[PDB]
Structure formats: structure tokens, C-alpha cells
Symmetry: C4
Subunit: 390 residues, 4 copies
């Protein structure tokens, strides 16, 4: 019955402690577990949940054949409580979706699920368990969205969407809803820039997003959104690249405005502003989706700094990672007067890196704390290949 404010500042944190780990793929060796992608977390005032995409198929079953396309007619968004595996019998249905975002305004859950044909996809907004509004593709080229938590401030929820080429100039938009109804939108002017799969969080009454340039950028785009949908758009200032693939730190020069690095492709990732500093997540490998570390760059939010002051390893470089994204703990759960910054790391198993017929992932979730946390590796741990691969 009450909207979450989410107007607070992000907590200044010295490190990240383990929240949860689902072990979904290990369990899936025998249990009944969805083949998934993007196990992103979002929290209501009472609990955090892991959302994920399914193909309607289970681990160790013929339907887990990974030849089916990502944007299939079978693709749905579902969810479970954080730390639970994406198993069938604990799962809540959310939306038909091959692209998704989701957030809670303090009263109910809002989800957006994109489905339909690439040429004219439909984004169906769900609020409180029923469809409430719709967004059709405005540019006829794979309407898509964050694949992480959206952001609700004082009852209104915001998210970023892209429509157009995945490797050249696309079009980018900010949408705003209240109670599952669209109340505003704004086109993001970003000539020469590329925005994909934004990882957002609230901070000081604004929505801050760290996204993925899939065009020429090895640094991450940053978009700061005000409630009237005026915005600031650019790149993460830091003189260290955090996309994948990327070049070496020493061969990089940062920019607050422009993409640097001259490389294609990318991986969904996140970053958290800490005053003027930044925490930036990245895969350990410069070239592959293996390992995951997080770095604190002093003045990295505002300057082309290379002054690294913290580093914490969460998945070693001997293990596969994947997508990563941001969310915050509601003050109603943390009991703090700031917004605890949190992230999930997806850990991809199977194709193409390993010899299976399938690909899935599991997650480790970490939350920002007031203390330095030691390095370690909470990797997926499943033993490949599986019975079905034989």
C-alpha cells in the first residue's frame, strides 16, 4: 500500500559480501531445472527475487538442444526467490519474453517482456500479474531492453530500451510508467554512441545506468535520468575499460563523452557511482567471458582516472562468467539510510565453450558492505558434459 521512495544516496561500500548462490546447474543434473539466461535480481520491500529467461526446457532433456534461437516463441520470463534455483515447482510466471526488465514500485511488481517478430516486436508491460500496457517497436529492428532490474522512484518506474542495429547506430529510448501505464518517454540523442542492456540503480533521486556499447566502445556508456526525463548521456569517465572484449588497461585512454577502444561486441555489465569514484565490474579475461572482478577507481565517475584503489575477485579466471547487472536493497529491508548497491554475476555453462548440446547459467549475488572482502571464487561448479550430451 506504500510506494518505495528510493530517493536516497547509494551507500559508499568498501567491498561486496556474498548474498546468494543458486547452484542451478549442479542441481539440474538430477532435478527439474529450467535452462536459462540472465538470472537478474530485483527486490520488493519484503524479498529479492531472481528473474530469468526460459525456453520451456529442462536441463538433461532433449528440448535443451541449444539450436533453438534466443528470440523463440517459447521464450518466457519467470522468477523465484533469490538463491533458489530456476526450478519448475518454485517458479512464478511473469511474461512472454525474449528480452526483459523488472522492478517493484513498493506496492506491486512491474515487468516488461518483449516478444514477437524482429521486424515489429511487442513489449508487454505487466503490473501486479496482468498485462496493463504495450510498446510496439518504433524502428522495426529487434525492440529490446535491459535484462536487469528496472528502477522505481516514488512510485514511477523507469527503464531504457533500444531498437535498431546491434553493431551500428541504433535508437535508444527512456520509458516511464506508473502502475503499469506508460506516462512518459524520451529519445536519447547519442550519435556515434551505442546503448544496450543497461544496468541501472537509483541514486540521489535519479536513475543511473551503466550499459553496453556493442558498436566500437570498450568503455561503458553512462546515462543519468531525471524524473522529468531530461537526461545526461555519455561514457564512464575512468581510464580503464570494463567491456568484453577490450584491450589492455595501459593501451587505453578514458573519455567522459565518447567511446574508446575501437572494438566490436560486448557483454552486459554494471558500475556503481560512489561520490566521484566508481565500482566497475568486468570479466578477468580481456577477450572471453571468464572470471569476474570488481574495481574501485578513485574519481572514475567524473575523471579519466586510472587510480585503482580497490579490487575484489569473485569468480577466478579458470571459470566461466557472463552477464552482470545492478540492483539495490530497499531501505525497508536493509534498515539503512542509504541504498545498498548490489550485483549478480551470471555464470554460463555449455556451448560454445564446452562440449554440450545446451547452454545454461547460474548466479552468484553479492551486496555492498562497509568492509574489505577477501578474494575467492564462487563459480558454477557443474560437472560437464551431462547425461543428455552422451
Amino acid at each position: 500500500g506504500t510506494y518505495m521512495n528510493n530517493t536516497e544516496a547509494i551507500c559508499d561500500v568498501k567491498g561486496f559480501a556474498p548474498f546468494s548462490k543458486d547452484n542451478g546447474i549442479r542441481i539440474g543434473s538430477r532435478g527439474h531445472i529450467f535452462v536459462i539466461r540472465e538470472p537478474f535480481v530485483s527486490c520488493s520491500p519484503i524479498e529479492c527475487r531472481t528473474f530469468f529467461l526460459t525456453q520451456g526446457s529442462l536441463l538433461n532433456d532433449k528440448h535443451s538442444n541449444g539450436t533453438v534461437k534466443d528470440r523463440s516463441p517459447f521464450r518466457t520470463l519467470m522468477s523465484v526467490k533469490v538463491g533458489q534455483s530456476p526450478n519448475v515447482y518454485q517458479a512464478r510466471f511473469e511474461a512472454v519474453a525474449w528480452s526483459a526488465t523488472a522492478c517493484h514500485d513498493g506496492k506491486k511488481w512491474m515487468t516488461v517482456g518483449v516478444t514477437g517478430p524482429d521486424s515489429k516486436a511487442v513489449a508487454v508491460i505487466h503490473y501486479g500479474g496482468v498485462p496493463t500496457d504495450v510498446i510496439n517497436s518504433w524502428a522495426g529492428d529487434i525492440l529490446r531492453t535491459q535484462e536487469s532490474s528496472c528502477t522505481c522512484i516514488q512510485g514511477d518506474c523507469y527503464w531504457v530500451m533500444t531498437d535498431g542495429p546491434a553493431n551500428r547506430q541504433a535508437q535508444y529510448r527512456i520509458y516511464k510508467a506508473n502502475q503499469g501505464r506508460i506516462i512518459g518517454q524520451a529519445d536519447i540523442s547519442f550519435n556515434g554512441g551505442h546503448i544496450e542492456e543497461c544496468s541501472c540503480y537509483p541514486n540521489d533521486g535519479k536513475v543511473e545506468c551503466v550499459c553496453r556499447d556493442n558498436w566500437t566502445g570498450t568503455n561503458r556508456p553512462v546515462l543519468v535520468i531525471s524524473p522529468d526525463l531530461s537526461y545526461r548521456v555519455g561514457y564512464l569517465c575512468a581510464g580503464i575499460p570494463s567491456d568484453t572484449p577490450r584491450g589492455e588497461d595501459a593501451q587505453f585512454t578514458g573519455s567522459c563523452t565518447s567511446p574508446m577502444g575501437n572494438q566490436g561486441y560486448g557483454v552486459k555489465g554494471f558500475g556503481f557511482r560512489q561520490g566521484t569514484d566508481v565500482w566497475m565490474g568486468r570479466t578477468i579475461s580481456r577477450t572471453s567471458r571468464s572470471g569476474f572482478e570488481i574495481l574501485r577507481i578513485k574519481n572514475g565517475w567524473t575523471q579519466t582516472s586510472k587510480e585503482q584503489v580497490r579490487k575484489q575477485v569473485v569468480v577466478d579466471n579458470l571459470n566461466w562468467s557472463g552477464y552482470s547487472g545492478s540492483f539495490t536493497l530497499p531501505v525497508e529491508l536493509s534498515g539503512k539510510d542509504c541504498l545498498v548497491p548490489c550485483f549478480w554475476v551470471e555464470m554460463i555453462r555449455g556451448k560454445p565453450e564446452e562440449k554440450t548440446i545446451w547452454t545454461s547459467s547460474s548466479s552468484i549475488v553479492m551486496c555492498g558492505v562497509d568492509y574489505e572482502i577477501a578474494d575467492w571464487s564462487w563459480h558454477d561448479g557443474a560437472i560437464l558434459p551431462f547425461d543428455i550430451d552422451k
Copy 2:
């Protein structure tokens, strides 16, 4: 503690967006999923649920042998939340039933389940999880009902029942209950007409139903029911047939009063009044239960019109469909001042079309929206035959 009014008008909609898809049969390749028929949807003020019939058997098990008769002593009505698969461990028991209808009056769930012998079946009304009243066969020939959501207006719930031949003159009745107790009934006078498996919804304080003629009609009967159980009965005026099998549109002349088409058999289907227009669902094939499209015929509710102004494809003609039925979103969930029109499409897999020992189905659920939605096909997607078929 409060009855749903459901006195509003049906929303005028330009198209239908995907609500949910369960992927039950794909999941059933490995998971523990009921073999089902008729995954019909009905909503309470807090959630929508998929109801379905079971035989007590699971996909990929010997008991899924489809030699067992529909009207078996094992047949039960169960339910899950919309988008969930009809799996064992999320299922709620409802009623012993080989024919069913179900609706929520705003306080509790009412279900009617028909079981017993063809010569003298018993319809047991359940309210709030216990049997409350009973209807015995009045004509000794397979007492049966809607296989879709019933309809509650201001606390009283209504439904249509048939008793008699499935291919000649039968008898048709309207029943009315409050709190699971029969409070009224009326015989439907329809000489030369045939009523089966009505798909109803509320509109303007009346219950409107689009049914199935299984006698000689390729157009659908329409029954409009007032709370005092006076009624209007006839056929969907539109000069386009929507039953299956049917002839071609060009070879058809509509009628508001009489069955046209001169063909036997049929398939459960639905239609929504839009002022004087209609949305009519139908299989794409004229002869088989494959594909599903919905058409808007201008003035089709009141005139023998052939003026098609909209068409949306939801399951292509390369894929199996089946039953379809109507329900509405409560205003308490939609947040609208009208009754959002919604439908589910059952997608039948296995016998007789495919070489398996079993038959089941899955669903796609769609809800009316204020925008045109692109064609696509959210088909079942299961890969037949299964392990058990070998």
C-alpha cells in the same frame, strides 16, 4: 470480503498482446506434468489462474495412454496460476470433473465439476473449496458445461449447461448461483439450434456467450443473459463463419437467428462484442484444428456484415490449435474503467494428428490492448514423439 461488480462495458480493443504461455508439454518431456485438455483461464481480484482437466496421469508415463475415455472416473479439475505448467507440485485440486466451468465472485472461487455416468451425471458445485450444491442430469444424456470461465456479476454467478444429443436437438439451460447455492435457472428455447461449450464474459451488466453448434451450424450461437434470467438467443450475425469445420467465407451467408453452413461437428471458440462490431476467434484451417487467428468484423454483432477491418494471427497454420475461450480482467487488476477482453488458445499435441500413444495440450493467453499487434506464432513447440512413444 467484497463482490466484484463486473457491470462495466468491455474495452474496445485494437489487438491482443501475449499474457502468458506455459510450455507445459516441452517441460513435460522431463518434468512432472499432467496430461490435460482445456487450459481455460479465469481471474479473481488478485490473480488469474489456468484451470484444466487431468486423467491422473503424467506426460511420458504409461498412464498417459490415450485409450482411456474422456469421461473417466479419474477425470479431475485442477488449476495453477496463469503461465505455470499444469505440473503436479504447483497444482490446486478443484473438483471431480470430466466437464467444468469456474469463476470468482470477488470473495471466493466457485467451480462446477460434472462427473458420473452419461445416463445420469452429477454436477457438483464447489464454493471456497468445498461442495455446496448439486445439479443432476435433467435429460439423461451427458450433462455438460462450458469448459471455460463462468461469469459473476455483483455476487451472482451464471453459466450455461447442455443435456442431450451432441449432434441433434439437445436441451440447454442457464443456471445462476450465489455463494455456491443455486438461486435460479431457465430453459433456453432454441428449436433447430445447438448450444455447446459456451465462452462467456460480462458486458454492460449482462452475460454474453459465444458457443458451439455441433449440429448443422458453421456460425456460432450467441446467448445474451440478463440477471433475471430472461435472455436473447440466436447466432453471431456476421457473414463469416468461425466454427471448425466450416466452408469458405465467400460461400457463406450470415444470420442473426439461424444456423448456416450445413456441416456437423465443431470446436469450442469465442467472440467479443465491441459496440456493434465483433472480434471472432477461429482456426486458420477451415477443416482442421490448426492455426489461430482473430478477426474484427465491423457491425458483425448486429449485422450480417462481411466487412473485416482487423486480423491478427497468434498461431500459424503450420501448428496445431484446439479449443479457445473468453474471460475478462477484473477492474481491480487492470486498473481500467472497462472490462479488458481476454482469451486463451489451447494447442493440442499427439493423437490423432501425430504418432504418439497420448494427447495433451498447452496454452497461449492473450489480452486485449489499445494498439495493433503484429502477427506471430506462439505455438506449443514440443518435439514429438516422446520417450514413452518408443
Copy 3:
């Protein structure tokens, strides 16, 4: 927060309509379902539940080997909602038990589970999910209880227990509890009589029980209990036997006071008083646990009557039955001003009648209605033997 009165009269009913059927054994062919006995029903103001005994073993698993003794250290009482199968993932734990009874006082659930050695068993009373009190064997010979719903009137709950020989004079006691604490007990004086496995229900502010004589009686003992624990004890007056095994009706003379029939063994069963009439359940076969019918004998509660005025078949004589027991619907669920009489019928599959290594059962539940209901057979339906038997 409110005690159920349960002071009303039992509804006069003309027949019994199907409430629920779990299909547990059919589902267990593939699903994860407890091997059970005694699927007895009891209702709280919000729902009815099926309770049952487990051995910690699942259908189609080696542990379902039926060589394990009934009174094992593994035996537990668990429960699910009525109509659900006794599956692992929907089950609620209740008590360690190889004999049980259970009832809800309107605020919480009370269960009594008997376990321990035959020479000195312990009956642990559970209230609201924790042990609250205890009853040790008073006669050192298999302390045991109803295996059906106990009975709560105005907050105090009553049940019948036996301790001693199963084929000669035993000792019988009535216990009374409030909030899981023993507040009273009474020895039942019944020289020459035998009381086992009572099926009780409330009626007119008293607890009426129809039990099993396992000594020499083919008619059923009847015990009527007042809240001060004064009681009346005897036999069901009717001149028709309802135990199994029994002789033929024509060879029987009834008695209100004494056992007739001169045969050993028995089967748990039930009966409902209707003014002075009775509804009596019994297996169809005189010698085996097959079939189930219910008969109304005019004046059968008070006279040695043979005047049968109703008969309804619920499981034909081609199918296995088993235990049966009584319970009532709370007025808070039925919405009636009387106590709707209800019964469950257990349907035993496997050993000794069939060639399997295991034995389990499933249930059909029926509730009294104001109308005559047609005969039919809602039998178990599982296809024996199973994979494990091969």
C-alpha cells in the same frame, strides 16, 4: 482466533456427491508420491486436508518394499489439501506416527501421533505445529487411535484410543484436550465388546462414533460421548452388518447392545445418524475389501431395523476399497446451519491382492447432499504392476 462451535445437528442427506479424488497411485507411476495408508480427511474453517501415513518411501522406488512393518521407526503422519496426491513437494509434516488422528479446533490444528515400541508406545499430541502433551501406553499392548478425524466442539477436542489385544478384550479410553493439553479422560466399560479405529463426527453437541469390532462382531460398535465424558456405548442397532468380513444380511439379527455375527477381523468404517435413521458404509463383498456402497436404514440408529430405503454405490465390486471414515464440513465453509456429513474411502492397491512388492492407496471423498446421487465407480485406476515390480 475463534473456536468452531460444531454444536449443530448433522444435515439430513439423501445422497453423497464427489468432493475429491487424488489419483495418487496413477500419478505415482512417474511422479514423486508417498507410499501411504489411511488418507483421512479433516477440515479447518478455511480448508479440508487429507492426512496420511508414510514410510518415508516413494512409489516405484526400492524402499517401497512392503516387507517393512506397519509400526516402523520410519512411519510419519503428513498431510496435503484434499484432492492433492500425497506427493513430497506439497506435503506438510505433522507427527511421528504409526497410528494417528487429527482435527482443527477453529484456531489451530491438533494432531496425535502414536509411535515407539508395542510394549510401551507414546502418543505425542501436537498443537499448532509443535508437541504440547503426551500419553503413554496404559496397558502395554499397542496404544493406538482412530486413523480418522478427531472431533472438536467449542474449543475442546475428543478422541478414542485403544490399548490391548486386537482380537480379544482390550481396554478403550476417551481423551479430551484443549489447545493440545489433556484436560480429561474416561475409561470405556465394554465387557465382551471390542473398539478399534473409531470414525467420529459431531452431532447435537455430542461426539458420535462408529467403530470396528475386531473380536467377534460383524456389526459396528457405537459410542456417544458427552462433553463431561459421560458416554453411551453399544452397537449399531440396525439388523444389517456393515463390517468386513461379515455374513449375509438375511442371516443376521441386529442388536443395540451386543456384537452379533461371530466372526473375527474387521475393517475401519463409518456411519452417520440421521434422526433415528442411519447411513452405513460398507464394502460390497462380504469377505473382501472390494467395492464400497452406502445404505440408509430407516430407524437403524435406534431399532434393529432391516428397512433399507436408500443405497448408493461409489466403488464397484470389481475394484479394491479399504478403510473408510467420517468427517464434517464446518458451517464456516458450507454456509449451512447444519453439519454436512462427509466420508473418504481408501482404495488399496498392491499386496496382498495383486502381484507387486508394495502396497499403497488412494482416496475418493464424498459429501452429503440434499439429492439422490446416481451409482458409479471412482476407483483408483492405477495400472499394476509398476516398473519397480519387474
Copy 4:
């Protein structure tokens, strides 16, 4: 919305009645059940739950290979209701953990899960389903905690932690939290003493703990903690040893202050103060983790007594036992004016005692009652080896 006082005295009990038994390993033969350790119980005002450690693996699956180390990156704390098996589809995620404790303050659940590298582990405190605070290793040698219920008194919760050698002098600390935030801590001075895996309970407004000396003691350390974190520390006075391994009773002399017995190793166990008497749990074997009995030693809490006045066997010496720990029933559930003393007994199956590739355990839970309870054995009961072992 209300804190539990837990200031009462422990109930004086004459024996222990069975609360629950999960049969997890028997069920796991076919069902989907976590491979676990330490099924410890803790209660909120509404229910008791079994907590347990998992490796992300299921019984009868290759991942159950017991070669994985206890302190793995996969190890998580999860929980179910008491008596339920640690199955996947009923499980609630709690914390990433290879060591754990958990308790409810009356408003919410607090859990502490230790994970990370031995050299610098991190203990993450969870309150109400999110991380709230952190404790890093203060001595760089396997930070660890109780593996049983912690203890909440008047809203503040306390627990004991160890950091250092498992076979020589370590360091021991008491921590105190409110609402998941550390509010106090104290170093335990215990030169020559060893504290591991404390089993605590509240009594008279203090926290009493009976722990495990893994250094030279066959008697158990006792630590009594006051809310200001002043404490009393020593050994269980009784002239009978209760650790495992241990020597014979006749060869033992007790001490209130010092470890006796001169043997290494140990097993988690418990004890309950009864005025000046004690109930002490122990394995029946002096050398192995088989059997479980509980003894009442008159004046054993305060004197080097050998006066055994009660003994109750719960698992015979023909069956495997394992860890044991203490918890109490809230007065809000028991309805008593004292704190009912309760314990769980873990029953370990598989390696090293039996020829399997895996090790798991199941539990029997017992609660103190006002009556003598007969000996019996509620052992695990699973039939080894399993399919996977072949």
C-alpha cells in the same frame, strides 16, 4: 512486530518425545533431495524449521560425489519446515555458507553464513532475507560458528564463533546483534580450553552453551553468557564424559573448570541445565558416531556427580548417529510458562562407514516432556548402497 522475550527458565523435563523425522535419505532414493549435513532446528513464534548445508547436489546424482571439500564455493545454507526432507522444491535459501547458525528474534529470521577462503573467511549476517552486516576472520584460520540455533533474548541475538586451530589453542568469541547489525562482541579467555560448534539455548535470561573440545577434552565446555557479554566459561561438571571419542565412565573424573580425558577429536553435542541437574546427549559407542542416548545426571551442572537418575535411548547402537544440537520452543507455540528444551539428532549415512561415493544425513527431533519416555530407535532407515554407487 513483537520481540520474543525468551527470559523464562528451561522446563524441567523427565524425558523427550518425538517431534519430527524427515526420512530424507529414504525419500532421496527417488525424490529430489539435497545431500546435506547438520539438519539443525530453530523456531520462530509460528513454526520450527530445519536448517541444513548443501553442496548444490542431489541424492543419487553424480554431483553427490563426496570428494568435494566441506568448505567448497558451492556450500549454501537452506531450510525447510521441521519434518520436511531437505528437498529442492520446498527449500528456502538462506546464505552462502560452509558454517552456519540461525535464530529468530520474534520479528524476523537472522542467519549467519561463513564462506570464503580458510585464510580470511567472511561471515555474512542475514536478517529478514537480505545481508545486513559482516564479520571477517580475526585470526586467519577458518572462521566458523555453531552449526545449531543461535539465541535471541528480548530482541538481541547471541552466538559463539571460533577462529584458529581445530586441534590446539584457538580463539573464541561471543557476538551479539540486533536486527542483523553487530552491537557487541567479547573475547572468551580459555587458555588450555577448546571451543567448537556450541549448542546453545536461553535459560533465566542468559545464554547457556554446551560445546565441543576438539583438543584434549572428552567432557564438554560450558559457556554461560549474560546480555552485557560478561560470561562464565568452563567445563560440564559431571563426572561422566559426553564427547566422542571418549573413555569409559568408570575411568573418568569430572571437572567444572578443566578438560579431562586426554583425547583428541570430538563431535558436536548438547546439554540442558535442569536446576543443578543436567541432561547430556551422547553417542552410545565411546569411539564411533553410532547410537544416541540422553542421560540425566543429578547435580551434574554444578558438581562432579556420577549420579545418573535417567536414561533414554533414541537411536540404538546398531545405527549411525552424528551431530546433535539444542533449541527451545517459544512460549508463543508451547503455551507454557517455561522454555521447552528440545534437540535434533543428525544421522549420517554413506562414507566413511559405508560403501557409497557420497555422505548425507537425516534427522530425528525430540522435545522435552513431563513424562518418562520409553527407549526406541528412530534411525535413518535408508537402504545402502544407492543406484549411483553402482
